[PDB]
Amino acid sequence: NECVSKGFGCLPQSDCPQEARLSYGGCSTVCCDLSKLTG
Numbered sequence: 642n643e644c645v646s647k648g649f650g651c652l653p654q655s656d657c658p659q660e661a662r663l664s665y666g667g668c669s670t671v672c673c674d675l676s677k678l679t680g
Contacts, residue, residue, distance in 0.1 A: 649663060650673065651673065652673035654671055661677060
């Protein structure tokens with residue numbers, strides 16, 4: 642889990658925009674960052 646290593650979460654296919662999606666396979670359908678909450 643690439644996203645879990647990097648400390649990120651996992652969002653649904655509707656709430657994660659195409660700008661916030663990560664380049665990794667750290668989830669089971671899509672992975673999204675959490676950096677918008679910190680800034």
